[PDB]
Design a binder for this molecule. Sequence first.
Ligand SMILES: [Zn+2]
Lengths: 47, 161
Amino acid sequence: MAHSPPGHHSVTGRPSVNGLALAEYVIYRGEQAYPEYLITYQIMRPE
Amino acid sequence: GTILIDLSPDDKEFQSVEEEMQSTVREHRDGGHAGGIFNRYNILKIQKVCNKKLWERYTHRRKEVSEENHNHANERMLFHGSPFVNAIIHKGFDERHAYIGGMFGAGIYFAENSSKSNQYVYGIGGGTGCPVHKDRSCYICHRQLLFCRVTLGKSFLQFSA
Ligand SMILES: [Zn+2]
């Protein structure tokens, strides 16, 4: 694994171009996330 | 250490999690190649993941970050998709759930869009699709995403035009 940019704890991928996209985020230490919910699902075929 | 506790569909906590899956689906620029063609999900089950030792590992790091950042953890609830969900819920996130080829270098990726995390359920770019039918748009096979508490602290802002 690579390190965080100096003085930072994470990277925020701010979406440009695609006006509808939300952000992505990257952390570099696994202890900075906890898996609270496991969601089991299917994608639905559109009508 | 890990225990999975089912949430009833009647629980307001089931509801608010499902509302966050459903309401963060968007259309993707691949037309569906990676994650399939859909506008919404059929939610089959939601389980609360309970591991004391992993939780303490999380809160310990959270306190460090918070004290490095004027008592602001910058904690979010984000989605994560991966074929190693079952290892993550038993052993935690570490460098073997890094995405080394990613847009922002090698680390662990999370998304506000549920549908973005869905592109990664069967691997990078969706891999070869579901194990049973080899179909990145499978409408039958059960998929799994994590909804995760993430400490961002001070976040490096990268623009992606
Ligand atoms: Zn399938």
